[PDB]
Design a protein around this ligand. Sequence first.
Ligand code: TGL
Ligand code: HEA
Ligand code: PEK
Ligand code: PGV
Ligand code: DMU
Ligand code: CUA
Ligand code: CU
Ligand code: MG
Ligand code: NA
Ligand code: ZN
Lengths: 105, 98, 46, 514, 227, 43, 144, 79, 259, 73, 84, 49, 58
Amino acid sequence: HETDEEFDARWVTYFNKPDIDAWELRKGMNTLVGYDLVPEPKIIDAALRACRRLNDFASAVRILEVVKDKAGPHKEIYPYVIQELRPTLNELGISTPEELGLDKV
Amino acid sequence: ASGGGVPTDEEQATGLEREVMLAARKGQDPYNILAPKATSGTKEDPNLVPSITNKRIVGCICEEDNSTVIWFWLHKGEAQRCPSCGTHYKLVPHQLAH
Amino acid sequence: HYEEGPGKNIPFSVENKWRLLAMMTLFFGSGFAAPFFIVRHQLLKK
Amino acid sequence: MFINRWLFSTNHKDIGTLYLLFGAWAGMVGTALSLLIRAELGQPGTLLGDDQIYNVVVTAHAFVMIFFMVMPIMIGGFGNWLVPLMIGAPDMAFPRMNNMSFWLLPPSFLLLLASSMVEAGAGTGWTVYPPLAGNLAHAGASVDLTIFSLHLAGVSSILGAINFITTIINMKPPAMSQYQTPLFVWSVMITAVLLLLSLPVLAAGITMLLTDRNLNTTFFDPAGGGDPILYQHLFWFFGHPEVYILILPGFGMISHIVTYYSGKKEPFGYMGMVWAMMSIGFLGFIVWAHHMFTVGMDVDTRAYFTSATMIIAIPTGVKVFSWLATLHGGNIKWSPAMMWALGFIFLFTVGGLTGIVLANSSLDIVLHDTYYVVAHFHYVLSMGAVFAIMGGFVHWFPLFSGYTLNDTWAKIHFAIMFVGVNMTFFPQHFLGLSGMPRRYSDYPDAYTMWNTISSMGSFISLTAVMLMVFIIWEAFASKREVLTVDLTTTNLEWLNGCPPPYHTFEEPTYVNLK
Amino acid sequence: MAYPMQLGFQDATSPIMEELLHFHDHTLMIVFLISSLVLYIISLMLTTKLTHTSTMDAQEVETIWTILPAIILILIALPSLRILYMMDEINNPSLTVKTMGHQWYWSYEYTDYEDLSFDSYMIPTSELKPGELRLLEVDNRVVLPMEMTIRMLVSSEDVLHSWAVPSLGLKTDAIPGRLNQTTLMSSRPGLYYGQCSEICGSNHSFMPIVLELVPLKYFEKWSASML
Amino acid sequence: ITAKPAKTPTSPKEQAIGLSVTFLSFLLPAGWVLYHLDNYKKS
Amino acid sequence: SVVKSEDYALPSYVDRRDYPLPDVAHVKNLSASQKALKEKEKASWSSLSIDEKVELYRLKFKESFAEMNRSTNEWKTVVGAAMFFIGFTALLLIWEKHYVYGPIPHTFEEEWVAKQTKRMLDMKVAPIQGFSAKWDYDKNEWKK
Amino acid sequence: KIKNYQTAPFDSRFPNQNQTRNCWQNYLDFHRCEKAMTAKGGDVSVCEWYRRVYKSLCPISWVSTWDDRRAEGTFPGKI
Amino acid sequence: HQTHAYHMVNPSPWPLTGALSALLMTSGLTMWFHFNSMTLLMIGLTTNMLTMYQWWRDVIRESTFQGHHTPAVQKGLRYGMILFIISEVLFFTGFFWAFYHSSLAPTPELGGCWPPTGIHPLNPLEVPLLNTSVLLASGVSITWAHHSLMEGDRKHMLQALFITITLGVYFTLLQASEYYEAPFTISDGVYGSTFFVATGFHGLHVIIGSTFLIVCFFRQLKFHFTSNHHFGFEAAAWYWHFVDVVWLFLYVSIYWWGS
Amino acid sequence: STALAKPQMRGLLARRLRFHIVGAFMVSLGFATFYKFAVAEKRKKAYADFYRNYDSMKDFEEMRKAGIFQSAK
Amino acid sequence: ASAAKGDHGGTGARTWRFLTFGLALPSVALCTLNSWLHSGHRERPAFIPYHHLRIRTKPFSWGDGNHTFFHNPRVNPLPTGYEK
Amino acid sequence: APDFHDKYGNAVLASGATFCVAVWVYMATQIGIEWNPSPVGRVTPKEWR
Amino acid sequence: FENRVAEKQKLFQEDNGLPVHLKGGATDNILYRVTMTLCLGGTLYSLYCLGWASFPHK
Ligand SMILES: CCCCCCCCCCCCCCCCCC(=O)OCC(COC(=O)CCCCCCCCCCCCCCCCC)OC(=O)CCCCCCCCCCCCCCCCC
Ligand code: HEA
Ligand SMILES: CCCCC/C=C\C/C=C\C/C=C\C/C=C\CCCC(=O)O[C@H](COC(=O)CCCCCCCCCCCCCCCCC)COP(=O)(O)OCCN
Ligand SMILES: CCCCCC/C=C/CCCCCCCCCC(=O)O[C@H](COC(=O)CCCCCCCCCCCCCCC)COP(=O)(O)OC[C@@H](O)CO
Ligand SMILES: CCCCCCCCCCO[C@@H]1O[C@H](CO)[C@@H](O[C@H]2O[C@H](CO)[C@@H](O)[C@H](O)[C@H]2O)[C@H](O)[C@H]1O
Ligand code: CUA
Ligand SMILES: [Cu+2]
Ligand SMILES: [Mg+2]
Ligand code: NA
Ligand SMILES: [Zn+2]
């Protein structure tokens, strides 16, 4: 296959397609979470902006949830990713699952 | 030596056997004996899936020699995509026996 | 044609759960009881 | 209509239902016989006061569990229900012959019950070795009725094997190669090939036993120049393929259950799993004389059979590791069917390993005809096959019936069964190593402790069996109808709904070649 | 004989049986390791929220899990076959004894020199002398010289039986019309017990074997007294 | 899997009845035979 | 919102951590406020309130990840019930001992066992490890 | 003369577990020899080795059945 | 309305009647062997024959008369017949195993020789050689019948098939005469046991295959077969060649090598 | 506040697997060593010590005097 | 092998009929001559009541229990010898 | 909303374990079952001849 | 003889709802009733014989 950098760029390019449709957004996220990795912030950034172009706030929040879920017991990964996305979250007005209370069982 | 008196299929085949024989003669396959050949499967050139009803099961062998087949109902209407590979399919319904 | 659907693709009725309990009791209970009674039969012959 | 549907069937699903009902009823008979065995052994001394009856009970227990519970459920029941659905086929190749394979089984079973009711029964062992099974040591009708029972069961399975091979080879979608068919379908094809080749040899051997008993032949009688060991070779030439026949459709179901509840689209290493089942099936024909290491066999023959037997561990280990690798990375759903399959993987492995111990003919001299052999096959066969059957049953019951089980009750059932079988059979290893013979109605006093524990274990599995009947009742009593099922894109048998219509795939699936 | 709560093999009475004990220890270590490894990996597969569900490539790992099992089998087969061929090796016995199975008792023939033969039946439980063993004692034991290589020939006069003495590592089926040979050598005097080991009908459980191993000179005088 | 609520719910009391009857159907006939074994063994 | 049997062939909703974006929305028929909320969603999400963001989430999804992933007390019911039925099994075994089994052989009487044990030590049963190996023949007692 | 018999020695013609043919061959050899000696006016003493070997190896009931069938004229081996 | 080519069969009583005929035949053999009575066995043989007649009658109705045997259905029947013949090969293999086991290691009770003391085998160059030429010749004539059918020649198909059947009958009568004339019997130890059970099952298969050819003869007389579609004739020919090949193995093994 | 350092994000499942398979190998080595000392060598040494100065005639004489034999009183 | 004949321009109906009448049936005619020329009854051997022959472990299910199914009094002795 | 397990699970667990232990201990110790454990360290050997 | 297969094809394809084993007409029904009567009556007779054979008659 490919280097880490090539892999990440391919996924950035996938979600950055201007006219990506709702089916392709879902297909992308549902495929990406099959891999043994937590997606790089730059990939998540492009997917959240795809959500914006698709007028889909709910899926943006769900994407943040699945980043947390893919980290499993590695509790340091999700706050790092949120930290790195904070300018994007602010620019797009995306609230985190925690800010919405959706992390409580 | 050499005589006749044995009927031929043309003379004597009947029922479904005869339907298959006569359709094969016309190069048609109403009883699904052949594997269909794929199109490019894009949104502009989707695989055309005939049906005598409004939905039909598709199995998609996404890549040659995949052992996993991906199965789904294809409904009449807008073309749908394989949930594994994205290739497009569109149902073309109806008829058979005139 | 034949009945289709849950509860209909089977040779026994599930229309009443107590009649069903009695049928299943007799069915599985007769299989379970048979060897005990065959042993009894062989012991009673000598 | 009732007679037309259920006695004149030509429908693969209804026939599958008949086999499941038959096999379940047979499983009760077999369980009762097993409880009588362990009641006789549960304390020192005699319970029945009649060891000929004890031997008849042991013999019947094995024939019932093998020919009337496992094979009908796995091949007749799950095979008929699932194989046509998994390949998109509208029925079996020979839908009317299919119905005769089913209806031969109640008469076969009646002949076996007749054998135990007339005279003093056939107290032979399920091996039916002459001369004990001959017309001097077992005069009268019982052994002949047993022979005919096996004849009818053999014809049923040979014809079913023809049907399954033909269906699987001939009735797939034209684009689907054999390497695009699901592993359960492969496991049934390979089981059928084994049935096809092995049952005719058994039929030859038991027919010779029949003529020795009734037509004054002497195939197995030294007075006429015959040989009792010839019967053993013909019996075990069938009998080793038979134990792989008993487990292979279980391996198929386990591959599907583990894949499904791991949330995977596919088992790990599909072609390795195909290779492994074909290799097991092939090696299964060249190992039979490990059932005969104490009959007076030359040393080079013992060396060969020891080595060829052990080789089977290699393809079997590929399947075990591949199931583990299918779990690996899964989003595990801890459903009751998953618990049965995980129990299978562990307990089958224990039993397989004690089989490898027995394969060493030098150790088998001391372990042959002891409870170590009984412990081996109740782990691999009794537990392996039963746990795969229970896992398949719980997994596919909503497909077949349209109704759900109570999952909590099903987990309770698993837990009870798991304790019971392990308490019953694990101490039998000690009994075997310390030299207790199998097929005994009583034992020297030193063997009391493990026999006592083993018999208490058998009652725990009884409680599990009674609970299972209640759990099926409760599901049919409550009528929770299925709405949605996950992973249909890689589990075609679910895609026509629950239960599927009488006729499915009247319009076949569309599959492209590209 | 076995003793209560026994877990493993009876103590070895012959050098072949000591070989088998060491070979069983070796094989059982391997059995325990593999079964525990499988159980451990199961627990490992099931104890993480981390996932990986895309298609996995299998050929690298299938090399490991065919080669390593093949090596383990060879490591069992090598000592296994060594014992097998060592047992088969030429021994030259000093004595031949025949045993014939019957429903349901054993007979013995010692006909190298004189015509000595007798039948050997289980002692009924009601007739046991204080401290004798239920289902194991016989009226006439198989007296044999200790520390000597003995040829046993085994056959039957009716159905199949099997002549077994676990502490000597012996089990040889008794087949009418066939004369099966095995060799026996006890390192020690004493009483060594076995039981019929091929189902032979309603008293299969009740036709035991008892060997009585003594110095040659006692065996000679016992033989003479049994004529 | 998802399912509809039961069309004919089986309450805890109904379950206790079904379980009790199921268990007695296995236990009573075998129990009767085994209780009387000695009446058979010397009949 | 009602899921019917006759919808089996259509894409359906699922909550699965490994399938985070399901094929359809949780809520298919919207109220008039929900419809207007969906229009507002086409403008800056910074202008949505927290309650409105939560409502948009619950229109798309049924359970959150935290909810769908929660642990339960079912294990207590399973383990306790299994123990109850295993306890019930012992009642069957008490009945069997009382009503089915007669006396065991006289060879299990204490005095028989004491004599049989001496005779096993006299014949040196399992003298290397198993039995007589544990008897001290010099001190006439079991080894400590 | 060349004695000190203890038991039948290993015989490379019959090296395996089934010794039926070893018993049979020595029974035949003994009676063939005894027949040749008794006929040609010799002494059966030269037959003794085969006698000792078959007595050591053969079940008493085999020997007794074969002896009866020789006396009956139904023994199927050639002597 | 289906749009596959496979055959959904009408609900049928013949599987059940066939299974019950099996119960009656086996029960009946038990009653004959142990309770001195032929009654159940005669009922079972009669119901077995009725079952076979009606079942195969219906297959002819389904195919010749109703057209249900599409090429896919016919291909499945080809596989089914091949697999059936394989199972019959393995059945005979058990009897050849029994024969070689007993004859390669003859026991002392036999005199330690094969053939046993007191057995006078048939001369393999007399009637057994004639039987061999008869079955080989019938393999040649049935091949002539097959080619005449494919070439559309009704009269010569009938003549060749008649000749084939006549040869099968001749074999059966010859073997019946040999059985009567044989100086050994099935009770003459393992020589008679292997001889009569192995050639007896073979003779049963000759009668079965002859019957199958006779069914084909009457179907041909009624014009059922076309020049391209005649699977019952192909199946009967495959079975007939199987019967011929089993005979050659019997001849070489039991009559010749075993003499 | 303080930024968080970037953590390992890739191959976490594979990493866990390799760590624990190595651990399992080490434990298996430990067990083999325990077993060959607590079972296998223990057995060889028991038999070797038993027979090193074993007197079969003395053993027999003790059994004979205790009355166990039919052939020797 | 190639036998020693030839054709192979086409193995159709005319060729197989040629083989049927030209080779197969002449062969049967020759073997029929060979057989019905070595026929004629041969002198039956002395009766010897060998214990591996004329086996009777159970009476047969027909006749008097002591006659085989295709019993021929000329050449099949009973356990006690040839019939009167 | 509490399900069956939230409401009854602690009771089912506690009662089931208590009952299971009590009845097996009673069965194993109070009803005359002879386990025939090892004589080693427990039986005083007694003259038999 | 003459080829009458077409007449049989018309008969067995007649749209009368009969299953193939009865579609030849009244003689099919008679043969079916004979077969099933012998099978079921024989099966009942075999059960009677089991009952008889299950007990000693000294
Ligand atoms: C295996 C399936 C599950 C089994 C569950 C039920 C069994 C209970 C746990 C079960 C605990 C499993 C460990 C084995 C028992 C250890 C006893 C032993 O040292 O036995 C050694 C030998 C003979 O050894 C000897 O010559 C020396 C004897 C030393 C005496 C010391 C005093 C011992 C006191 C009495 C102990 C009572 C034993 C327990 C009595 C058991 C009553 C049921 O016996 C044998 O060969 C028996 C072994 C048969 C071969 C099959 C093994 C398959 C692997 C089992 C799973 C392991 C991974 C899971 C690890 C365990 C996960 C569960
Ligand atoms: C499901 C049925 C089943 C199965 C699958 C098996 C599988 C095996 N069995 Fe057996 N067996 C029986 C049912 C079965 N058996 C029965 C019923 C009998 C008794 C018949 C009678 O007498 O009544 C019997 C008897 C029997 C005997 C005769 C013992 C005697 O009578 O003295 C032997 C001897 O070799 C044997 C060996 C094996 C072996 C080596 C396997 C192998 O196929 C097992 C392979 C599996 C593994 C080894 C575990 C998984 C593998 C790994 C985890 C990989 C790594 C492993 C290693 C390197 C070892 N079995
Ligand atoms: C020209 C060839 C003709 C062959 C057929 C002849 C009539 C028999 C009818 C059925 C044949 C079926 C199978 C054959 C099985 C038994 C072998 C019999 C072959 C035969 O006919 O052997 C004859 C004896 O037959 C006997 O016992 C007669 C015995 C008749 C009763 C047979 C009992 C049936 C037992 C069959 C069980 C079959 C189980 C099949 C299982 C199939 C798979 C499930 C030999 O006669 P003889 O007087 O001993 O010697 C001749 C001396 N002059
Ligand atoms: C004394 C006499 C009785 C003795 C007892 C034994 C009885 C003898 C039974 C003889 C077997 C007769 C079989 C007749 C089958 C007729 C039906 C048939 O041949 O059916 C054909 C299908 O083949 C098919 O089912 C193929 C069906 C294959 C059947 C093979 C049967 C072998 C039976 C063996 C049974 C015993 C086994 C051995 C016992 C140890 C129909 O297709 P076509 O021919 O293409 O026609 C269609 C065309 O017309 C269209 O143009
Ligand atoms: C392995 C399978 C078996 C597992 C354990 C079975 C558990 C037993 C359940 C109870 O069975 C019943 O027990 C009664 C005794 O408790 C019996 O009554 C018997 O005893 C009563 C009291 O002595 C009398 O009143 C009755 O008439 C007399 O039949 C009764 O017949 C029997 O059905
Ligand atoms: Cu003699 Cu078992
Ligand atoms: Cu085997
Ligand atoms: Mg054995
Ligand atoms: Na007992
Ligand atoms: Zn695809």
